[PDB]
Amino acid sequence: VENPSLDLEQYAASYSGLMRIERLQFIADHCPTLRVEALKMALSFVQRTFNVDMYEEIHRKLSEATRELQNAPPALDTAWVEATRKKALLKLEKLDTDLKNYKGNSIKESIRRGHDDLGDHYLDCGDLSNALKCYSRARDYCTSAKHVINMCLNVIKVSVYLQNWSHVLSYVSKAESTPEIAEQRGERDSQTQAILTKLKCAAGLAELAARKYKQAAKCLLLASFDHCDFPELLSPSNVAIYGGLCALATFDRQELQRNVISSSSFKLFLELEPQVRDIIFKFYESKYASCLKMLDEMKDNLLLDMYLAPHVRTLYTQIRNRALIQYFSPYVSADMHRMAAAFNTTVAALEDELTQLILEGLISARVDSHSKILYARDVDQRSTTFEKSLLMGKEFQRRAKAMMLRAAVLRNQIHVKSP
C-alpha cells in the first residue's frame, strides 16, 4: 500500500481546505515514503485551518518513522502550535462576540453573512458542525433569493472540502428547484464556475461512491471548462480524469463520437488529459496489450486517487472487458495462439477469464482447448427456438398436471394439521 505517481504539490499549491490535508494525510497513510511526503504537506497546510488532532497524530508518526530510519542514526513541533491554538481560540471568542453583535443587529443579510464568516474561520480551527450549523441557519435569512442561491452554493462548497455528497446533492436539487440555476444563459452568458457542473461533479463523485460511472463521465463531459479554473478544491485535472476514465471504462465508441469524438467543453479537459486521451486512442487502436499497459502505468496515480483507489481495478476490469468484447467482436473464431499473438499475454488465465465470459461475458464462441483456439458460436434462431419451445412446453405440461393436483389439494381440502 504505497504509490508514487500523484502530484499534491500543485494540489496543495492551489486546492485547499479540508480535502487538501484530507487527501494529503489519507493517501499518505496508504503510501509510505510519501506517507512521509503527503503527511508533510498536510503538516504544511495545518498552518491553515488550525486542527491539530491528526496534526499531532502525524507528529507522533513522524518521531516513529524517524527512529525507523534513525534506527542506526521526529520532533513535529506543536507546543508553539499550542500557544497558537490558544491565540486562535481567543480569535474564536472574538468571532463569537461579533456573531452576537450581529445577532443584536437582527439582519437577515448581516446575520446570515455572520454565519458565513464564523463557519469560514471554523475552517481555521478544524470546526465542522460549527460552520455546518452556521450556514444551515444562514439559509433562513431570505431577504433575497440570493440568500437561498448562495446558501446552497457555499454549503455545497463547504461539503466539497467536507467530503459530503449525497444530501449535499440534496442541496443541489433544492438549489436547482426554485431560483433557476444557470440563469437561462449559462448563469447569464458563461456561468464561469459552471454551478450546475459543480452540482454534476457532486453527483458524479457521489456516484463514484455509488458506482454510476457512465453517469459519472456523463455529467463530467456535462462539466465544461467555462471557469477554466477552480482552485477551491476541485481540479480540472480531477474532473478531467473523472470524465475521461469514467467514459473509457463505461462509454462506447459511439458515445465517443456522440460525446468524446465530439468533446469540446471537455476538449479543454481533453488537452488537459493527454494520456487518458491517448488510452482512448488505443481503444480506437484496440492496442489491448499496450492499451492496458498504459492503463496500469497510469494505475499508480489512478489508485492514488482517493476516489479511484476504491474503484481503480473495477475500472480496469470494465476496460479489458469492453476491450476484448471489441476484440472478438469481428471474429467467428479466435485462434488462441494467434489470439495471444495479438495480446502477447498468457491466455491461460486470460482464457480462464474468457471461460467466465462464456459463463457471463459476450462469448458466443467455442474452444477446442485441445485446439487452443476460440470458435464463435453462430447465434441459432431455428433450433434455439425449438429448444425454448419444447422447454416451455415441458414446463407448461408439468405445471399442467401440477395445477390439476393443486386444484385437487384445494378441492380435497387437505391441510397438515400441526398436532
Binding site: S371, R382, F386, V409, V416, S418, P419
Partner: protein, 201 residues
C-alpha cells in the same frame, strides 16, 4: 414435482413426511439438477413458519453445493449421516458428488470443444485423464455428450447437434407435445364449464 406439490399443498404441521419430502426434493434440485431450485409459487406457510427454519440441513446443502467443496461435502455428510441411514437412503453423498461432476462437466460443455482429461482432471475433478477415461466413457455413455472417442488423443468434441426437428419423428415428438397440450386445454374447458356448472348465487 412430487415433493414441491406436497409442500405447496396446504399444510400446518411438521413431519419427516414433509421433512424428507424437502429431503428428496432438494436432492433433486441439487444432485439431479444443475443447482439450487428456487422457492415454489404457492408454497405452504408453516414451512417458513416451522419447517423452513428446520431446514438447516439443506441450507448447508445448497451452501456447500455453491461451495464446490468435497471436504465440506463429507463434513455435512457426517452431519446428516442419520438421514443418510434413515430409510435405506445411503449414498446421498455420492449423489451430491455426481451433481458436482454435473456442475463441472456442464460448465465445461458449452465453454469448450475438447479438453485434456488430466487438465480437466483439475477442472471437473476427472481424477487424472485415465479415471477421466472412464469419465469420457460416461460422457458418451450416460447420455452425456455430443462427442465420441478420439482415442488417438482420447478427445471429446462437444456438438449439441441433436435435431432441428429435422427428422419428422421429431416433428411427431412435437405431435405428442400437441396431443398432451390439446387434451389439456380440452379438460381445461370441461372444468371451466364445471365451475360454470357450479350452483351460482
Amino acid at each position: 414435482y412430487f415433493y414441491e406439490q406436497a409442500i405447496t399443498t396446504p399444510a400446518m404441521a411438521v413431519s419427516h413426511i414433509m421433512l424428507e419430502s424437502y429431503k428428496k426434493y432438494i436432492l433433486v434440485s441439487l444432485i439431479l439438477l444443475g443447482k439450487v431450485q428456487q422457492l415454489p409459487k404457492y408454497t405452504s406457510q408453516i414451512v417458513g413458519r416451522f419447517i423452513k427454519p428446520l431446514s438447516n440441513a439443506y441450507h448447508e446443502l445448497a451452501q456447500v453445493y455453491s461451495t464446490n467443496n468435497p471436504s465440506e461435502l463429507r463434513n455435512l455428510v457426517n452431519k446428516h449421516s442419520e438421514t443418510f441411514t434413515r430409510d435405506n437412503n445411503m449414498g446421498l453423498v455420492k449423489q451430491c458428488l455426481s451433481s458436482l461432476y454435473k456442475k463441472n462437466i456442464q460448465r465445461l460443455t458449452k465453454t469448450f470443444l475438447t479438453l485434456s482429461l488430466q487438465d480437466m482432471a483439475s477442472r471437473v475433478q476427472l481424477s487424472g485423464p485415465q479415471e477421466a477415461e472412464k469419465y469420457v466413457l460416461h460422457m458418451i455413455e450416460d447420455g452425456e455428450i455430443f462427442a465420441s472417442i478420439n482415442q488417438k488423443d482420447g478427445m471429446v468434441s462437444f456438438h449439441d447437434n441433436p435435431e432441428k426437428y429435422n427428422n419428422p419423428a421429431m416433428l411427431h415428438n412435437i405431435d405428442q407435445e400437441m396431443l398432451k397440450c390439446i387434451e389439456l386445454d380440452e379438460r381445461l374447458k370441461a372444468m371451466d364449464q364445471e365451475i360454470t356448472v357450479n350452483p351460482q348465487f
